[PDB]
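Quick one from the shared queue. A colleague (R.T.) flagged DCLRE1A as missing a structural entry in our internal table.

Convert sequence to structure tokens.
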Amino acid sequence: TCPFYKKIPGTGFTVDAFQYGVVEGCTAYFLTHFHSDHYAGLSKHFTFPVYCSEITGNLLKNKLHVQEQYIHPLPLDTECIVNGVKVVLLDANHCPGAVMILFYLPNGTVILHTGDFRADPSMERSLLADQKVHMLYLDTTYCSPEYTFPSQQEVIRFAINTAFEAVTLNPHALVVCGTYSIGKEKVFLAIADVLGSKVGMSQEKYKTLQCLNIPEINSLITTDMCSSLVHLLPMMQINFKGLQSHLKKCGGKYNQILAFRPTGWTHSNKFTRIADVIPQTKGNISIYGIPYSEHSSYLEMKRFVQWLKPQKIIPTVNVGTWKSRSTMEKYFREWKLEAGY
Ligand code: NI
């Protein structure tokens, strides 16, 4: 049954609630981004209205085969009316098409649902600056102080230099990148750019990237593996056995694989810097895990919430244990006391 933290009170609205069948009294279903835990339930046999971004729209149409009539895309940074309630979609700085949603309730209450996000100081100069937020439904994925990680810019610099070096030393070395969802496209595209290659992928994956309104995308990707020296594979296949297997398949064109696994956080972040990261090697195969996060670090989250100063916070991640809930409420109190709201 639909949990409370996916219901928007004083509306007929839910957010990311597609796996509970028909939710008693919902007139419009919001989808924040195209990730499977969030869209779980949608299919071609869905007949209620779905509100989302243009890009999340292209993906529901073309990947899930939801029918054109039930997909309601909205532009970002624009005041829009939906069943008599003013709403605004903002960029969540998560994966492509990922949005936060502001609800302006008839009674004067104002609600922000972050979906998944990586908080940034640039959000402090959006339409959020213009008025007061009473409730915050918050992505709390890394809501604990141990969770530190570098900026996206730093991680990309590391990857670019690592790849460029290894390929300038051995022109017969292949770079391979893992993927299982949308998001994190920058890793493989920035590596391809430094190497003057296009990225090579399956037909299912090419299709997915065609949905994302990436500028000049036809110039950056391809389904011809042979012409491309950066290859995407399913993340499951990023291990010694899977890569060895894939090296066989290239037909004596390459003698070395360098590979990148974009992890989230990993306990090595408590002891080591980005500059100091080392791969796992076995023969002509090396695999780097790199901490490219599309979620807030603890400090980024804290800063955002302290600037926003909401009256109530309702977490949407790590809600399933009493220990998690309790730990989060302590950090929310600390934040509120340190900042005076
Ligand atoms: Ni997500």
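The radius of gyration is 22 Å.
Residues 33, 35, 94, 116 surround nickel (II) ion (CB under 6 Å).
Added to the table.
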